[PDB]
Amino acid sequence: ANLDIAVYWGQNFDERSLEATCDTGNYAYVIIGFLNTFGGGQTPALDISGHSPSGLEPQIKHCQSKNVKVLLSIGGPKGPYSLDSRSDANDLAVYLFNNFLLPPGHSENRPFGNAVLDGIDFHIEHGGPSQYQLLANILSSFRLAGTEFALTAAPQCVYPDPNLGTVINSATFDAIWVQFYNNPQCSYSSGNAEALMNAWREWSMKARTKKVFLGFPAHPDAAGSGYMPPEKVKFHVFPAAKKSYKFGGIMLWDSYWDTVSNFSSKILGEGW
Ligand SMILES: OC[C@H]1O[C@@H](O[C@H]2[C@H](O)[C@@H](O)[C@H](O)O[C@@H]2CO)[C@H](O)[C@@H](O)[C@@H]1O
Protein backbone atom coordinates (compact mmCIF):
# COMPACT_ATOMS: atom_id res chain seq x y z
CA ALA A 1 0.00 0.00 0.00
CA ASN A 2 1.99 2.99 1.43
CA LEU A 3 -0.81 5.42 0.65
CA ASP A 4 -0.61 9.15 -0.09
CA ILE A 5 -3.82 10.98 0.80
CA ALA A 6 -4.72 14.52 -0.22
CA VAL A 7 -7.44 16.39 1.67
CA TYR A 8 -9.31 19.64 1.14
CA TRP A 9 -9.28 22.05 4.06
CA GLY A 10 -11.08 25.31 4.76
CA GLN A 11 -14.69 24.23 4.30
CA ASN A 12 -15.99 24.95 7.82
CA PHE A 13 -15.40 27.60 10.47
CA ASP A 14 -15.69 24.94 13.17
CA GLU A 15 -13.37 22.37 11.60
CA ARG A 16 -10.21 20.85 13.04
CA SER A 17 -7.46 23.44 12.54
CA LEU A 18 -4.90 23.21 9.74
CA GLU A 19 -2.03 22.42 12.12
CA ALA A 20 -4.02 19.73 13.93
CA THR A 21 -5.04 18.40 10.52
CA CYS A 22 -1.38 18.01 9.55
CA ASP A 23 -0.42 16.64 12.93
CA THR A 24 -2.69 13.64 12.30
CA GLY A 25 -0.01 12.26 9.99
CA ASN A 26 -2.66 10.97 7.57
CA TYR A 27 -2.00 13.33 4.69
CA ALA A 28 0.75 14.02 2.17
CA TYR A 29 -1.17 17.04 0.80
CA VAL A 30 -3.51 19.57 2.38
CA ILE A 31 -5.42 21.79 -0.04
CA ILE A 32 -6.80 25.09 1.19
CA GLY A 33 -9.99 26.22 -0.46
CA PHE A 34 -11.07 28.47 -1.91
CA LEU A 35 -9.89 31.58 -3.79
CA ASN A 36 -13.42 31.76 -5.22
CA THR A 37 -13.54 35.35 -6.46
CA PHE A 38 -11.63 36.62 -9.48
CA GLY A 39 -12.07 37.97 -12.99
CA GLY A 40 -14.87 40.04 -14.49
CA GLY A 41 -13.58 43.27 -13.01
CA GLN A 42 -13.47 41.69 -9.55
CA THR A 43 -10.63 41.87 -7.06
CA PRO A 44 -9.44 38.40 -5.92
CA ALA A 45 -10.96 37.17 -2.67
CA LEU A 46 -10.84 34.12 -0.45
CA ASP A 47 -13.69 32.14 1.00
CA ILE A 48 -12.10 29.92 3.61
CA SER A 49 -15.23 29.80 5.78
CA GLY A 50 -14.24 32.62 8.12
CA HIS A 51 -10.82 31.34 9.18
CA SER A 52 -8.34 34.17 9.64
CA PRO A 53 -6.04 34.15 6.57
CA SER A 54 -3.22 35.79 8.54
CA GLY A 55 -3.74 33.27 11.31
CA LEU A 56 -2.89 30.44 8.91
CA GLU A 57 0.72 31.62 8.48
CA PRO A 58 2.23 29.71 11.46
CA GLN A 59 0.03 26.68 10.71
CA ILE A 60 1.14 26.42 7.08
CA LYS A 61 4.76 26.60 8.26
CA HIS A 62 4.22 23.90 10.87
CA CYS A 63 2.52 21.70 8.29
CA GLN A 64 5.51 22.09 5.96
CA SER A 65 8.01 21.44 8.73
CA LYS A 66 6.30 18.06 9.09
CA ASN A 67 6.70 17.37 5.36
CA VAL A 68 3.07 18.03 4.46
CA LYS A 69 2.59 19.98 1.24
CA VAL A 70 0.18 22.92 1.41
CA LEU A 71 -1.69 24.02 -1.71
CA LEU A 72 -4.11 26.88 -2.53
CA SER A 73 -7.11 25.96 -4.61
CA ILE A 74 -8.55 28.45 -7.06
CA GLY A 75 -12.21 28.49 -8.09
CA GLY A 76 -14.24 25.94 -6.15
CA PRO A 77 -17.77 24.38 -6.15
CA LYS A 78 -19.38 27.80 -6.04
CA GLY A 79 -18.31 31.39 -6.52
CA PRO A 80 -18.37 34.42 -8.83
CA TYR A 81 -15.11 33.44 -10.50
CA SER A 82 -14.33 33.65 -14.22
CA LEU A 83 -11.31 34.06 -16.51
CA ASP A 84 -12.96 35.26 -19.70
CA SER A 85 -10.18 37.56 -20.95
CA ARG A 86 -6.44 37.27 -21.57
CA SER A 87 -5.78 40.14 -19.17
CA ASP A 88 -7.63 38.27 -16.42
CA ALA A 89 -5.39 35.22 -16.85
CA ASN A 90 -2.27 37.40 -16.73
CA ASP A 91 -3.49 39.41 -13.73
CA LEU A 92 -4.33 36.33 -11.65
CA ALA A 93 -1.09 34.55 -12.60
CA VAL A 94 1.01 37.50 -11.45
CA TYR A 95 -1.04 37.92 -8.25
CA LEU A 96 -0.81 34.23 -7.26
CA PHE A 97 2.92 34.28 -7.90
CA ASN A 98 3.81 37.33 -5.76
CA ASN A 99 1.47 36.67 -2.88
CA PHE A 100 1.61 32.91 -2.40
CA LEU A 101 4.42 31.26 -4.33
CA LEU A 102 7.34 33.64 -3.66
CA PRO A 103 8.90 34.87 -0.44
CA PRO A 104 7.92 38.40 0.39
CA GLY A 105 9.89 41.27 -1.04
CA HIS A 106 8.88 43.85 1.55
CA SER A 107 5.26 43.19 1.89
CA GLU A 108 2.24 43.74 4.15
CA ASN A 109 0.06 42.72 1.19
CA ARG A 110 -0.02 38.98 1.42
CA PRO A 111 -3.08 37.15 2.76
CA PHE A 112 -1.18 34.31 4.45
CA GLY A 113 1.60 36.61 5.53
CA ASN A 114 5.10 35.25 4.95
CA ALA A 115 4.03 31.71 4.19
CA VAL A 116 5.19 30.34 0.84
CA LEU A 117 2.77 27.76 -0.55
CA ASP A 118 3.80 24.52 -2.28
CA GLY A 119 1.37 24.91 -5.18
CA ILE A 120 -1.88 25.87 -6.87
CA ASP A 121 -4.95 23.65 -7.28
CA PHE A 122 -7.29 24.21 -10.25
CA HIS A 123 -10.77 23.38 -8.94
CA ILE A 124 -12.64 25.00 -11.83
CA GLU A 125 -16.23 23.77 -12.00
CA HIS A 126 -17.83 26.37 -14.29
CA GLY A 127 -16.84 28.74 -17.06
CA GLY A 128 -15.55 26.35 -19.70
CA PRO A 129 -11.90 26.23 -20.69
CA SER A 130 -11.71 29.98 -21.16
CA GLN A 131 -8.31 31.32 -20.57
CA TYR A 132 -7.35 28.65 -18.08
CA GLN A 133 -4.82 27.31 -20.59
CA LEU A 134 -3.15 30.74 -20.69
CA LEU A 135 -3.17 31.03 -16.88
CA ALA A 136 -1.51 27.62 -16.53
CA ASN A 137 1.09 28.56 -19.17
CA ILE A 138 2.26 31.58 -17.22
CA LEU A 139 2.30 29.69 -13.92
CA SER A 140 4.19 26.92 -15.67
CA SER A 141 6.60 29.55 -17.01
CA PHE A 142 7.33 30.81 -13.47
CA ARG A 143 7.98 27.24 -12.37
CA LEU A 144 10.60 27.10 -15.14
CA ALA A 145 12.12 30.34 -13.83
CA GLY A 146 13.32 28.83 -10.56
CA THR A 147 10.25 28.99 -8.30
CA GLU A 148 9.51 25.33 -7.71
CA PHE A 149 5.88 24.55 -6.96
CA ALA A 150 3.21 22.10 -8.10
CA LEU A 151 0.20 22.58 -10.35
CA THR A 152 -2.79 20.31 -9.76
CA ALA A 153 -6.37 20.03 -10.92
CA ALA A 154 -9.58 18.46 -9.57
CA PRO A 155 -11.77 17.58 -12.61
CA GLN A 156 -15.16 15.90 -12.46
CA CYS A 157 -15.33 12.19 -13.27
CA VAL A 158 -16.59 12.49 -16.84
CA TYR A 159 -13.78 12.43 -19.38
CA PRO A 160 -12.87 14.71 -20.96
CA ASP A 161 -13.66 17.35 -18.34
CA PRO A 162 -15.78 20.17 -19.85
CA ASN A 163 -13.92 22.84 -17.90
CA LEU A 164 -10.33 21.56 -17.66
CA GLY A 165 -10.13 18.93 -20.42
CA THR A 166 -8.15 20.98 -22.93
CA VAL A 167 -5.83 22.29 -20.23
CA ILE A 168 -5.10 18.80 -18.85
CA ASN A 169 -4.22 17.71 -22.41
CA SER A 170 -1.27 20.13 -22.32
CA ALA A 171 0.32 17.87 -19.67
CA THR A 172 0.97 20.84 -17.39
CA PHE A 173 -0.36 19.23 -14.18
CA ASP A 174 1.88 17.27 -11.83
CA ALA A 175 -1.08 15.59 -10.18
CA ILE A 176 -4.78 15.21 -10.83
CA TRP A 177 -7.47 14.16 -8.33
CA VAL A 178 -10.62 13.14 -10.16
CA GLN A 179 -13.82 13.74 -8.22
CA PHE A 180 -15.56 10.39 -8.19
CA TYR A 181 -18.68 11.80 -6.53
CA ASN A 182 -21.80 13.89 -7.27
CA ASN A 183 -22.25 12.25 -10.69
CA PRO A 184 -23.81 8.74 -11.02
CA GLN A 185 -22.41 8.30 -14.54
CA CYS A 186 -18.91 7.78 -13.20
CA SER A 187 -19.03 7.28 -9.46
CA TYR A 188 -20.06 4.58 -7.03
CA SER A 189 -23.78 3.95 -6.58
CA SER A 190 -26.20 1.26 -5.46
CA GLY A 191 -23.65 -1.46 -4.65
CA ASN A 192 -22.36 -1.04 -8.21
CA ALA A 193 -18.80 0.05 -8.97
CA GLU A 194 -19.02 -0.63 -12.72
CA ALA A 195 -19.50 3.04 -13.66
CA LEU A 196 -16.64 4.01 -11.32
CA MET A 197 -14.31 1.26 -12.53
CA ASN A 198 -14.85 2.25 -16.16
CA ALA A 199 -14.29 5.94 -15.44
CA TRP A 200 -11.07 5.14 -13.63
CA ARG A 201 -9.68 3.07 -16.52
CA GLU A 202 -10.27 5.98 -18.85
CA TRP A 203 -8.61 8.58 -16.64
CA SER A 204 -5.59 6.42 -15.79
CA MET A 205 -5.06 5.64 -19.47
CA LYS A 206 -5.77 8.97 -21.12
CA ALA A 207 -4.95 11.71 -18.58
CA ARG A 208 -1.62 13.32 -19.45
CA THR A 209 -0.22 13.68 -15.97
CA LYS A 210 2.21 11.75 -13.85
CA LYS A 211 -0.15 11.08 -10.98
CA VAL A 212 -3.88 10.38 -10.87
CA PHE A 213 -5.66 10.30 -7.50
CA LEU A 214 -9.12 8.90 -6.83
CA GLY A 215 -11.34 11.46 -5.10
CA PHE A 216 -13.97 10.25 -2.62
CA PRO A 217 -16.26 11.91 -0.10
CA ALA A 218 -15.21 11.19 3.50
CA HIS A 219 -18.82 10.86 4.60
CA PRO A 220 -22.35 10.16 3.22
CA ASP A 221 -23.30 13.77 4.04
CA ALA A 222 -20.21 15.29 2.40
CA ALA A 223 -21.56 14.77 -1.14
CA GLY A 224 -24.87 14.21 -2.89
CA SER A 225 -23.82 10.83 -4.23
CA GLY A 226 -20.80 8.58 -4.60
CA TYR A 227 -19.93 7.66 -1.01
CA MET A 228 -18.11 4.34 -0.85
CA PRO A 229 -17.23 2.62 2.48
CA PRO A 230 -13.48 2.28 3.34
CA GLU A 231 -13.61 -1.53 3.47
CA LYS A 232 -15.00 -1.51 -0.08
CA VAL A 233 -12.46 0.98 -1.45
CA LYS A 234 -9.60 -1.20 -0.20
CA PHE A 235 -11.19 -4.42 -1.43
CA HIS A 236 -12.66 -3.17 -4.72
CA VAL A 237 -10.51 -0.35 -5.96
CA PHE A 238 -6.96 -0.75 -4.70
CA PRO A 239 -6.19 -4.11 -6.36
CA ALA A 240 -6.96 -2.76 -9.85
CA ALA A 241 -5.74 0.78 -9.19
CA LYS A 242 -2.28 -0.13 -7.93
CA LYS A 243 -1.77 -1.99 -11.20
CA SER A 244 -1.66 1.41 -12.89
CA TYR A 245 1.66 3.20 -13.25
CA LYS A 246 -0.15 6.48 -12.76
CA PHE A 247 -1.78 5.57 -9.45
CA GLY A 248 -1.26 8.43 -7.01
CA GLY A 249 -3.31 7.58 -3.93
CA ILE A 250 -6.65 9.02 -2.91
CA MET A 251 -8.11 12.49 -2.42
CA LEU A 252 -10.68 13.17 0.28
CA TRP A 253 -13.50 15.67 0.39
CA ASP A 254 -13.07 16.88 3.03
CA SER A 255 -11.08 17.43 6.30
CA TYR A 256 -14.15 18.52 8.28
CA TRP A 257 -15.97 15.28 7.43
CA ASP A 258 -12.92 13.01 7.72
CA THR A 259 -12.53 14.19 11.33
CA VAL A 260 -16.06 12.84 11.94
CA SER A 261 -15.95 9.61 9.91
CA ASN A 262 -12.30 8.60 10.61
CA PHE A 263 -12.27 7.49 6.97
CA SER A 264 -8.52 8.04 6.39
CA SER A 265 -7.68 6.21 9.64
CA LYS A 266 -9.55 3.12 8.41
CA ILE A 267 -8.00 3.14 4.95
CA LEU A 268 -4.51 3.21 6.51
CA GLY A 269 -5.26 1.09 9.63
CA GLU A 270 -5.34 3.96 12.10
CA GLY A 271 -1.99 5.84 11.54
CA TRP A 272 0.12 7.82 12.77
O1 LIG B 1 -4.62 38.46 5.78
C1 LIG B 1 -6.03 38.73 5.96
C2 LIG B 1 -7.14 38.95 6.99
O2 LIG B 1 -8.58 38.22 6.97
C3 LIG B 1 -9.41 38.96 7.91
O3 LIG B 1 -10.66 38.34 8.03
C4 LIG B 1 -11.79 38.78 7.44
C5 LIG B 1 -12.27 37.73 6.39
O4 LIG B 1 -11.32 37.61 5.34
C6 LIG B 1 -13.55 38.27 5.80
O5 LIG B 1 -14.08 37.40 4.80
C7 LIG B 1 -14.58 38.39 6.94
O6 LIG B 1 -15.82 38.94 6.42
O7 LIG B 1 -14.09 39.26 8.00
C8 LIG B 1 -12.87 38.75 8.56
C9 LIG B 1 -12.69 39.40 9.94
O8 LIG B 1 -13.40 39.87 10.99
C10 LIG B 1 -8.88 38.78 9.28
O9 LIG B 1 -9.53 39.67 10.17
C11 LIG B 1 -7.49 39.27 9.29
O10 LIG B 1 -6.98 39.04 10.61
C12 LIG B 1 -6.62 38.37 8.32
O11 LIG B 1 -5.31 38.49 8.48
Tab-separated table of C-alpha atoms and ligand atoms in Angstrom:
chain	number	residue	atom	x	y	z
A	1	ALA	CA	0.000	0.000	0.000
A	2	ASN	CA	1.989	2.992	1.433
A	3	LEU	CA	-0.810	5.420	0.652
A	4	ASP	CA	-0.615	9.150	-0.087
A	5	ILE	CA	-3.817	10.983	0.801
A	6	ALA	CA	-4.723	14.523	-0.222
A	7	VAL	CA	-7.438	16.389	1.672
A	8	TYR	CA	-9.314	19.640	1.140
A	9	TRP	CA	-9.280	22.049	4.058
A	10	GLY	CA	-11.080	25.313	4.761
A	11	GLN	CA	-14.688	24.225	4.300
A	12	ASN	CA	-15.989	24.948	7.816
A	13	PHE	CA	-15.397	27.601	10.474
A	14	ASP	CA	-15.694	24.936	13.174
A	15	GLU	CA	-13.368	22.371	11.598
A	16	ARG	CA	-10.215	20.855	13.043
A	17	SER	CA	-7.461	23.440	12.541
A	18	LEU	CA	-4.896	23.209	9.743
A	19	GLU	CA	-2.035	22.416	12.122
A	20	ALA	CA	-4.016	19.727	13.929
A	21	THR	CA	-5.041	18.405	10.524
A	22	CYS	CA	-1.377	18.006	9.545
A	23	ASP	CA	-0.423	16.640	12.930
A	24	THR	CA	-2.687	13.640	12.297
A	25	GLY	CA	-0.011	12.256	9.989
A	26	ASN	CA	-2.658	10.969	7.571
A	27	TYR	CA	-1.997	13.335	4.692
A	28	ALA	CA	0.755	14.019	2.171
A	29	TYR	CA	-1.170	17.036	0.802
A	30	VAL	CA	-3.507	19.575	2.380
A	31	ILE	CA	-5.419	21.793	-0.039
A	32	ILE	CA	-6.796	25.093	1.191
A	33	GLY	CA	-9.987	26.216	-0.464
A	34	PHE	CA	-11.073	28.470	-1.908
A	35	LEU	CA	-9.892	31.579	-3.790
A	36	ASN	CA	-13.416	31.758	-5.222
A	37	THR	CA	-13.542	35.346	-6.456
A	38	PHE	CA	-11.629	36.622	-9.481
A	39	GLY	CA	-12.068	37.966	-12.993
A	40	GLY	CA	-14.871	40.039	-14.494
A	41	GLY	CA	-13.576	43.268	-13.011
A	42	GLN	CA	-13.467	41.693	-9.554
A	43	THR	CA	-10.631	41.871	-7.061
A	44	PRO	CA	-9.444	38.399	-5.916
A	45	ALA	CA	-10.961	37.169	-2.665
A	46	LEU	CA	-10.840	34.117	-0.451
A	47	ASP	CA	-13.685	32.144	0.999
A	48	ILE	CA	-12.100	29.922	3.610
A	49	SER	CA	-15.231	29.797	5.777
A	50	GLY	CA	-14.239	32.615	8.122
A	51	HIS	CA	-10.822	31.340	9.178
A	52	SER	CA	-8.341	34.167	9.642
A	53	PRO	CA	-6.035	34.146	6.573
A	54	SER	CA	-3.222	35.790	8.541
A	55	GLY	CA	-3.742	33.272	11.313
A	56	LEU	CA	-2.889	30.440	8.911
A	57	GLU	CA	0.718	31.624	8.485
A	58	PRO	CA	2.225	29.708	11.462
A	59	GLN	CA	0.031	26.682	10.713
A	60	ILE	CA	1.137	26.416	7.076
A	61	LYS	CA	4.764	26.597	8.262
A	62	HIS	CA	4.217	23.904	10.867
A	63	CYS	CA	2.516	21.698	8.295
A	64	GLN	CA	5.507	22.092	5.963
A	65	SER	CA	8.012	21.438	8.733
A	66	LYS	CA	6.297	18.064	9.091
A	67	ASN	CA	6.697	17.370	5.364
A	68	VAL	CA	3.072	18.027	4.457
A	69	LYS	CA	2.589	19.979	1.241
A	70	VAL	CA	0.182	22.924	1.414
A	71	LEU	CA	-1.686	24.019	-1.715
A	72	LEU	CA	-4.106	26.881	-2.532
A	73	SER	CA	-7.112	25.958	-4.608
A	74	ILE	CA	-8.552	28.450	-7.062
A	75	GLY	CA	-12.213	28.490	-8.085
A	76	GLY	CA	-14.241	25.945	-6.154
A	77	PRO	CA	-17.770	24.385	-6.151
A	78	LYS	CA	-19.377	27.798	-6.043
A	79	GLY	CA	-18.314	31.393	-6.515
A	80	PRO	CA	-18.372	34.424	-8.826
A	81	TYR	CA	-15.114	33.439	-10.499
A	82	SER	CA	-14.334	33.648	-14.220
A	83	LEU	CA	-11.313	34.064	-16.514
A	84	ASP	CA	-12.962	35.259	-19.699
A	85	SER	CA	-10.181	37.558	-20.949
A	86	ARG	CA	-6.441	37.272	-21.575
A	87	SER	CA	-5.778	40.138	-19.167
A	88	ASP	CA	-7.634	38.269	-16.418
A	89	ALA	CA	-5.390	35.218	-16.850
A	90	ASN	CA	-2.268	37.396	-16.725
A	91	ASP	CA	-3.488	39.409	-13.730
A	92	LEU	CA	-4.334	36.330	-11.652
A	93	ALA	CA	-1.087	34.546	-12.600
A	94	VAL	CA	1.005	37.500	-11.445
A	95	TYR	CA	-1.043	37.918	-8.255
A	96	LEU	CA	-0.810	34.230	-7.264
A	97	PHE	CA	2.925	34.281	-7.898
A	98	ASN	CA	3.807	37.328	-5.763
A	99	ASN	CA	1.472	36.668	-2.877
A	100	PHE	CA	1.613	32.906	-2.397
A	101	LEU	CA	4.420	31.265	-4.332
A	102	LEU	CA	7.335	33.641	-3.663
A	103	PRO	CA	8.900	34.866	-0.435
A	104	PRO	CA	7.923	38.397	0.394
A	105	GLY	CA	9.894	41.267	-1.043
A	106	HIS	CA	8.884	43.845	1.554
A	107	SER	CA	5.257	43.194	1.893
A	108	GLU	CA	2.238	43.735	4.147
A	109	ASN	CA	0.059	42.717	1.194
A	110	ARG	CA	-0.015	38.980	1.420
A	111	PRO	CA	-3.077	37.145	2.757
A	112	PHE	CA	-1.179	34.311	4.452
A	113	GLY	CA	1.603	36.612	5.531
A	114	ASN	CA	5.103	35.251	4.954
A	115	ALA	CA	4.028	31.710	4.188
A	116	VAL	CA	5.193	30.339	0.839
A	117	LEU	CA	2.772	27.763	-0.548
A	118	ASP	CA	3.799	24.525	-2.281
A	119	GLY	CA	1.374	24.908	-5.177
A	120	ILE	CA	-1.885	25.874	-6.873
A	121	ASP	CA	-4.953	23.647	-7.281
A	122	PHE	CA	-7.288	24.210	-10.251
A	123	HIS	CA	-10.766	23.381	-8.945
A	124	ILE	CA	-12.642	25.002	-11.833
A	125	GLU	CA	-16.231	23.774	-11.998
A	126	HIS	CA	-17.830	26.366	-14.287
A	127	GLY	CA	-16.839	28.744	-17.058
A	128	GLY	CA	-15.548	26.346	-19.705
A	129	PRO	CA	-11.897	26.232	-20.694
A	130	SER	CA	-11.709	29.983	-21.158
A	131	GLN	CA	-8.308	31.316	-20.574
A	132	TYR	CA	-7.346	28.652	-18.078
A	133	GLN	CA	-4.823	27.310	-20.587
A	134	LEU	CA	-3.148	30.742	-20.695
A	135	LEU	CA	-3.168	31.033	-16.885
A	136	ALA	CA	-1.514	27.617	-16.527
A	137	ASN	CA	1.085	28.562	-19.174
A	138	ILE	CA	2.257	31.577	-17.220
A	139	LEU	CA	2.295	29.694	-13.918
A	140	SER	CA	4.189	26.922	-15.673
A	141	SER	CA	6.604	29.552	-17.009
A	142	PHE	CA	7.327	30.813	-13.471
A	143	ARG	CA	7.985	27.243	-12.371
A	144	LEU	CA	10.597	27.098	-15.140
A	145	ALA	CA	12.116	30.341	-13.826
A	146	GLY	CA	13.319	28.828	-10.556
A	147	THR	CA	10.255	28.986	-8.299
A	148	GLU	CA	9.512	25.335	-7.714
A	149	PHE	CA	5.878	24.548	-6.959
A	150	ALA	CA	3.205	22.102	-8.101
A	151	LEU	CA	0.200	22.575	-10.348
A	152	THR	CA	-2.788	20.311	-9.757
A	153	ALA	CA	-6.375	20.028	-10.924
A	154	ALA	CA	-9.576	18.460	-9.575
A	155	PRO	CA	-11.767	17.577	-12.609
A	156	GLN	CA	-15.157	15.900	-12.458
A	157	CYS	CA	-15.326	12.192	-13.274
A	158	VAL	CA	-16.589	12.493	-16.839
A	159	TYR	CA	-13.778	12.428	-19.375
A	160	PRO	CA	-12.874	14.709	-20.955
A	161	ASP	CA	-13.664	17.354	-18.339
A	162	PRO	CA	-15.783	20.166	-19.852
A	163	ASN	CA	-13.916	22.841	-17.900
A	164	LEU	CA	-10.332	21.556	-17.660
A	165	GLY	CA	-10.127	18.926	-20.418
A	166	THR	CA	-8.148	20.976	-22.934
A	167	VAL	CA	-5.834	22.288	-20.226
A	168	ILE	CA	-5.096	18.797	-18.854
A	169	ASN	CA	-4.224	17.708	-22.406
A	170	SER	CA	-1.271	20.131	-22.324
A	171	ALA	CA	0.317	17.865	-19.674
A	172	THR	CA	0.971	20.837	-17.387
A	173	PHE	CA	-0.358	19.225	-14.179
A	174	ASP	CA	1.877	17.274	-11.827
A	175	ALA	CA	-1.078	15.589	-10.178
A	176	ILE	CA	-4.784	15.212	-10.827
A	177	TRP	CA	-7.468	14.158	-8.334
A	178	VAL	CA	-10.619	13.138	-10.157
A	179	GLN	CA	-13.823	13.745	-8.219
A	180	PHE	CA	-15.562	10.386	-8.191
A	181	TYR	CA	-18.676	11.801	-6.534
A	182	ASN	CA	-21.798	13.891	-7.274
A	183	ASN	CA	-22.255	12.245	-10.691
A	184	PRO	CA	-23.813	8.744	-11.021
A	185	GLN	CA	-22.414	8.296	-14.544
A	186	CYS	CA	-18.914	7.781	-13.202
A	187	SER	CA	-19.034	7.285	-9.460
A	188	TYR	CA	-20.057	4.579	-7.029
A	189	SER	CA	-23.776	3.953	-6.584
A	190	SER	CA	-26.197	1.259	-5.463
A	191	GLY	CA	-23.653	-1.456	-4.653
A	192	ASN	CA	-22.359	-1.035	-8.212
A	193	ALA	CA	-18.797	0.055	-8.971
A	194	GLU	CA	-19.023	-0.630	-12.723
A	195	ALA	CA	-19.502	3.040	-13.660
A	196	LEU	CA	-16.645	4.012	-11.320
A	197	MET	CA	-14.314	1.261	-12.530
A	198	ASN	CA	-14.847	2.245	-16.160
A	199	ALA	CA	-14.288	5.939	-15.439
A	200	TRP	CA	-11.066	5.136	-13.631
A	201	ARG	CA	-9.681	3.074	-16.519
A	202	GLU	CA	-10.274	5.975	-18.853
A	203	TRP	CA	-8.610	8.579	-16.643
A	204	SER	CA	-5.593	6.416	-15.791
A	205	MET	CA	-5.058	5.645	-19.469
A	206	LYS	CA	-5.767	8.973	-21.115
A	207	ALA	CA	-4.947	11.710	-18.578
A	208	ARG	CA	-1.617	13.320	-19.453
A	209	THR	CA	-0.218	13.682	-15.968
A	210	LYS	CA	2.213	11.751	-13.846
A	211	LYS	CA	-0.152	11.080	-10.981
A	212	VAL	CA	-3.881	10.379	-10.866
A	213	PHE	CA	-5.662	10.297	-7.501
A	214	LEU	CA	-9.125	8.899	-6.830
A	215	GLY	CA	-11.342	11.457	-5.105
A	216	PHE	CA	-13.966	10.251	-2.625
A	217	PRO	CA	-16.260	11.909	-0.102
A	218	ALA	CA	-15.214	11.190	3.498
A	219	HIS	CA	-18.817	10.862	4.596
A	220	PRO	CA	-22.349	10.164	3.221
A	221	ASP	CA	-23.300	13.772	4.042
A	222	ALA	CA	-20.206	15.289	2.396
A	223	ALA	CA	-21.557	14.775	-1.136
A	224	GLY	CA	-24.867	14.207	-2.888
A	225	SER	CA	-23.818	10.828	-4.227
A	226	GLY	CA	-20.798	8.584	-4.596
A	227	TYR	CA	-19.934	7.662	-1.014
A	228	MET	CA	-18.115	4.336	-0.850
A	229	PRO	CA	-17.226	2.617	2.479
A	230	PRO	CA	-13.477	2.276	3.343
A	231	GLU	CA	-13.613	-1.534	3.470
A	232	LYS	CA	-15.004	-1.507	-0.081
A	233	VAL	CA	-12.459	0.977	-1.447
A	234	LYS	CA	-9.601	-1.204	-0.196
A	235	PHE	CA	-11.193	-4.419	-1.434
A	236	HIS	CA	-12.657	-3.171	-4.715
A	237	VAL	CA	-10.507	-0.346	-5.963
A	238	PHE	CA	-6.963	-0.753	-4.703
A	239	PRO	CA	-6.194	-4.110	-6.362
A	240	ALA	CA	-6.965	-2.759	-9.849
A	241	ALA	CA	-5.738	0.783	-9.191
A	242	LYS	CA	-2.283	-0.129	-7.926
A	243	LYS	CA	-1.773	-1.987	-11.202
A	244	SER	CA	-1.658	1.411	-12.894
A	245	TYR	CA	1.664	3.202	-13.250
A	246	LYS	CA	-0.145	6.478	-12.764
A	247	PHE	CA	-1.783	5.574	-9.449
A	248	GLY	CA	-1.261	8.434	-7.008
A	249	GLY	CA	-3.314	7.576	-3.935
A	250	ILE	CA	-6.655	9.015	-2.907
A	251	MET	CA	-8.108	12.493	-2.415
A	252	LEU	CA	-10.685	13.175	0.285
A	253	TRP	CA	-13.496	15.669	0.386
A	254	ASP	CA	-13.070	16.876	3.028
A	255	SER	CA	-11.083	17.431	6.295
A	256	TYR	CA	-14.145	18.517	8.277
A	257	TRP	CA	-15.970	15.279	7.425
A	258	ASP	CA	-12.920	13.014	7.723
A	259	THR	CA	-12.528	14.190	11.329
A	260	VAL	CA	-16.056	12.843	11.939
A	261	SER	CA	-15.952	9.612	9.905
A	262	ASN	CA	-12.302	8.603	10.609
A	263	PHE	CA	-12.271	7.491	6.968
A	264	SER	CA	-8.517	8.036	6.389
A	265	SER	CA	-7.682	6.211	9.641
A	266	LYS	CA	-9.545	3.121	8.411
A	267	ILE	CA	-8.005	3.138	4.945
A	268	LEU	CA	-4.514	3.209	6.513
A	269	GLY	CA	-5.260	1.093	9.625
A	270	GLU	CA	-5.339	3.963	12.101
A	271	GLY	CA	-1.987	5.841	11.537
A	272	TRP	CA	0.118	7.824	12.769
B	1	LIG	O1	-4.620	38.462	5.784
B	1	LIG	C1	-6.025	38.733	5.960
B	1	LIG	C2	-7.139	38.951	6.988
B	1	LIG	O2	-8.584	38.219	6.965
B	1	LIG	C3	-9.407	38.964	7.911
B	1	LIG	O3	-10.656	38.337	8.035
B	1	LIG	C4	-11.789	38.779	7.441
B	1	LIG	C5	-12.275	37.726	6.390
B	1	LIG	O4	-11.322	37.605	5.338
B	1	LIG	C6	-13.552	38.274	5.800
B	1	LIG	O5	-14.082	37.399	4.795
B	1	LIG	C7	-14.576	38.388	6.936
B	1	LIG	O6	-15.820	38.944	6.423
B	1	LIG	O7	-14.094	39.255	8.000
B	1	LIG	C8	-12.872	38.751	8.563
B	1	LIG	C9	-12.691	39.404	9.941
B	1	LIG	O8	-13.402	39.870	10.987
B	1	LIG	C10	-8.883	38.777	9.275
B	1	LIG	O9	-9.533	39.667	10.165
B	1	LIG	C11	-7.494	39.267	9.288
B	1	LIG	O10	-6.976	39.037	10.609
B	1	LIG	C12	-6.616	38.373	8.323
B	1	LIG	O11	-5.306	38.492	8.481
